[PDB]
Amino acid sequence: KKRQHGLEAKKSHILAARSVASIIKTSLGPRGLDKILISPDGEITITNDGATILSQMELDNEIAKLLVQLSKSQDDEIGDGTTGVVVLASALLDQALELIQKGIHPIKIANGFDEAAKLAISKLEETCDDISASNDELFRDFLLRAAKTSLGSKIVSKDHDRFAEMAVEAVINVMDKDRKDVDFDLIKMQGRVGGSISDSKLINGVILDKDFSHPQMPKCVLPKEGSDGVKLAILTCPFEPPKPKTKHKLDISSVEEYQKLQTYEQDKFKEMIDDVKKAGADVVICQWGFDDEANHLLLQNDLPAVRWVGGQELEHIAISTNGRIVPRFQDLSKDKLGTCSRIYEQEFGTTKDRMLIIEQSKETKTVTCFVRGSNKMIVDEAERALHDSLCVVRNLVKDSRVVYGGGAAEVTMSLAVSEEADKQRGIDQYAFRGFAQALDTIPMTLAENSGLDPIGTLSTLKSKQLKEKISNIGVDCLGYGSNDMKELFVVDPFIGKKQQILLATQLCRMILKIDNVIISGK
């Protein structure tokens, strides 16, 4: 335990995360770079994501918990463009260091941010556009314009046309005709390492690591004679020869009683296969294993089955097939049968393990993007990049207002807060301008990684937005030349920038109020 008072724990505590957050600063925007982080277990995770790095990174100062606690709420709120947003989350604490040297009270610094935060949002509401005013066709065209700037962020952005139709067609299957709804829970992306990254397709369903046991039949049967969705079924109770699970004892007083125990399972072997054959269910998933003597009769009756399937994947199958998993053998009925359009096992590599793929060609509740790639490290990075796209469309649904991206929002509200600071006067004039000054570091940081003059671009933005009130002029991240964002189809959700900046401002209010740091062991 150390004794820290005064500017010791009121400055270096903020300066700590200031040097830590400057590490990921080089990853801002599509021009950013990746990083290597070795886990304590020895594994290595390579990603540029600000939330993924800070989650598994073990630091010293307790301020790291404040940065992770914010990212926990951001994933459930916005979680869109994490590489872009994570940099501006710490930009509010950098400007507060200059106001402390000037003699402003730390609480007056924190209270001055919330005053200018409500006025900056009102200015952003002027230039926002309503995408919901159009039809469904123009709405999907707005998604294609947004999926270019928004969806593509990290690596694999080389070819963005392969994943463009993946995110667009994913929200088309599950959506309301009035364009108010979201479900991101039934959409799960399970990828594999193989082939090329351009081989990704759209297959709605789940990918099971376990294949069909008893390699004495065909790997996949595409059609079905009974039609009606192949009659998918899942048994909740484990599949075993029936025996009491509770403690019991057997008493054999004669040879005949021992012979009846032989025909005991023999009568149950035929009883279990006939109840399934009577229902005609082709796909029967056993949760825990199966009986060795029944490993044949399933193929004899043409009953493909699998073993050791996780309960999480079983929930997505029943909701996708619109069926109900069978809780009890006596409760087995044709009313609980599911609907499966096509089921097959992917060849994957040479041998390896064949991956069972359940696919529904029609509208289904479980939407999945088929993903294959050569690099193993890009798997978790490319999936989580498209996982945020589920919340991107969600921001366009719940919030019909959309603003032009490219850092043009912070420049637009910069001129408003500068004018609103002169109305209050007092000591808050420099405090309100400081809140807008911290937001002015975002455009200068965007041009840092691209090799463009930070101020030379920022000076043109305020000069151009002075004559015309349109916000389409913004920072050019990828080097497209002219800074008009309307021709480049660069748009960002309104609620995305709203909450992520507001929640960061609300959190920094309590951070600047920290004076003494007391750390005790667990």
């Binding site: 990746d34 290597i36 304590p40 090329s196 004495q216 009491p244 490993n295 009769l297 690099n375």
Partner: protein, 513 residues
Amino acid sequence: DQVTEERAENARLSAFVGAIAVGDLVKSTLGPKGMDKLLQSASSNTCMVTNDGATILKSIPLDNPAAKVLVNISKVQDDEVGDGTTSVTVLSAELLREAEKLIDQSKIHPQTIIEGYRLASAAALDALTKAAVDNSHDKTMFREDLIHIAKTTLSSKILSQDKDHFAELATNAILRLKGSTNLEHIQIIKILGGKLSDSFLDEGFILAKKFGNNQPKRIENAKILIANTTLDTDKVKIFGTKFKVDSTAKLAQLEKAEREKMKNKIAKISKFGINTFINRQLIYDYPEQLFTDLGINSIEHADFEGVERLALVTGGEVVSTFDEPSKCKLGECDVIEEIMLGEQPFLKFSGCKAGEACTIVLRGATDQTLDEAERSLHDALSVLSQTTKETRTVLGGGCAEMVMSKAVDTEAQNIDGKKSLAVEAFARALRQLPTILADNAGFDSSELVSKLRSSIYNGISTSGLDLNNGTIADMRQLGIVESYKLKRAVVSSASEAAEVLLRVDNIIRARPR
């Protein structure tokens, strides 16, 4: 605590040298003329000598993350080519080395360097597609070109001098599969002893087991049955049962009921009309004598991998629940006899009912060649099976990399700007891949490669490098050709993996637990 972090200054230099240091071991393994390496394991004191880095780089501990992704992508190469796949790590190491010299000279931002490799990879796909030749239209030349495709892919191991004896093995075996891409159908057995050229291709199955006591070593016109039922351990139950008896009289009746259990079980087996029986587990003495009384062969101790290969090669089916004798199928072979291959005699099958699979007999001088021939035959017919699916092929052997250099150089003129430096760097690094190949045979990589470079620009596509004579020879005359599907995945994955390694500005080392 104890977290060592390197900024863009240290991490940029440390990440590039990491792949170059370990990459020097796989540079000499390129091509049929490539060399091998040795690894000393601290556990069991074993070693693996091979030119394929999938089993080399995986067992080499390394603290540089730059080569960690290179090992994971080797499984993709293990699922496609499998032989001579070290060029993926060699070409990636050259891209990291040329980019290291490109940032020290041009001093452009690393993201711009990646944008140059993105436009350079597009020109490489156009040169391979326009040069793709499809001979599948003529079935006569198709079966003959499979030998030329084989001669390229089947030279890896030290035994490649025997390829002329081994070319007939993969030629007739791919014709027997008729579309079987799985290695579980292909029967690969290892035999110690005999000459290196003694390996032959026999039609049938070879079993390493034997007959227990009275089973005749030669059985003709036999019905082969495969059963997963339990024999050796008998009574083992696993019920909730317990045993209570008043006197030893009924105690022996339980053993008498055990005989009646097996007597009624062999009665259902006798209804099958089989002269051959196979079990997954061991066979108890009592049913072993019952097999000899009824004239039924006995085979035991077939593991999970071997129980399938019996029915897959012979076309049979694993049968359980004997209560349905006529609902299943029975395997059949013309001649079932015990032969002697090497020291351990083996059980030979002849005249299988289904020719869907074949058995390749492998005899070699040393144990080092056992796992060495396994790696060469790991992907052998599967490579030929992928040529059955994708029939477009292109001349390989180092010339195809020079043909793509002409397309990249042509595209570099239309691009120009400051991004052409990274585009030209990809062409310069690609031309160094056959240069290292010429360095492995000890021949001239200067004058020969310089002539091959001007020959591609003169409009001669068939020009290539001769490995045996060390001169300029046409690949169509030597018979060196590779499929379009394999080479496309090698060049693309090497460039995609190199884009990630150039993006590392930081290396964080956590304190070990």
